[PDB]
Amino acid sequence: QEALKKVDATKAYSVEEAVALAKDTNIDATVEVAYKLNVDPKKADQQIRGAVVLPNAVEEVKAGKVTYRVDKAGNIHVPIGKVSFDNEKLVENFNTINDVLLKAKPSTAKGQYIKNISVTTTFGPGIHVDQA
RNA sequence: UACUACCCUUGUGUUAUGAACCCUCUAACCCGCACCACUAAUCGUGGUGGGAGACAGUGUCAGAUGGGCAGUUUGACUGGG
Ligand SMILES: [Mg+2]
Ligand SMILES: [Mg+2]
Ligand SMILES: [Mg+2]
Ligand SMILES: [Mg+2]
Ligand SMILES: [Mg+2]
Numbered sequence: 001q002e003a004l005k006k007v008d009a010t011k012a013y014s015v016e017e018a019v020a021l022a023k024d025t026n027i028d029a030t031v032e033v034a035y036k037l038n039v040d041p042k043k044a045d046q047q048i049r050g051a052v053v054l055p056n057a058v059e060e061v062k063a064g065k066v067t068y069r070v071d072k073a074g075n076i077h078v079p080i081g082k083v084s085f086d087n088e089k090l091v092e093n094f095n096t097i098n099d100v101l102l103k104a105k106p107s108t109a110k111g112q113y114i115k116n117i118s119v120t121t122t123f124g125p126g127i128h129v130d131q132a
Numbered sequence: 133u134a135c136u137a138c139c140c141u142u143g144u145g146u147u148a149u150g151a152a153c154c155c156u157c158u159a160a161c162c163c164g165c166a167c168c169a170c171u172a173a174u175c176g177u178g179g180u181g182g183g184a185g186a187c188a189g190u191g192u193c194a195g196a197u198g199g200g201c202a203g204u205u206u207g208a209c210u211g212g213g
Contacts, residue, residue: 034138071139125137
């Protein structure tokens, strides 16, 4: 019950803090990056989509290719591996995800591109962050 | 299908805000209401009560009405016109 309470909903944890406490907030569980976007998810020009390997078709099918694709809700969220993975390796996984998602930008975006941003797991409560 | 969150439509609430509308207040404005003083003054200015009251009045802007008023128009040909 109290795993939903221990997490500091007020604070924007760093990537490192987030992946570290993701190990705790499980009571096994796949960690999950989540963006809520400023784009229009209901138009073809902004249907963000793709797939990328977690380093932590053997290069794709076996190496741990996780797919990302934004839903109609504007919420694109992707697995980045289990809580039993090393936390700096989770930082590397999120580096992969964040870099590829930011560099896959629809050029017609607005002043803000990420409305909200957070982490969860298969039993992870929300861990909101501020892109750093 | 459990459960975690990213959440999305729909409609309930708290709070902060913005408008419209009704009532209530009085402290602005007003009283060809009373009393006091200036003061011998049916003026006026103040003071004290009472009444109305953020209306009215006044200013600006706009719409309707407007011979009450004003300025003007109201052809030529043509066996007169
Ligand atoms: Mg009279
Ligand atoms: Mg006339
Ligand atoms: Mg003249
Ligand atoms: Mg004539
Ligand atoms: Mg004639």
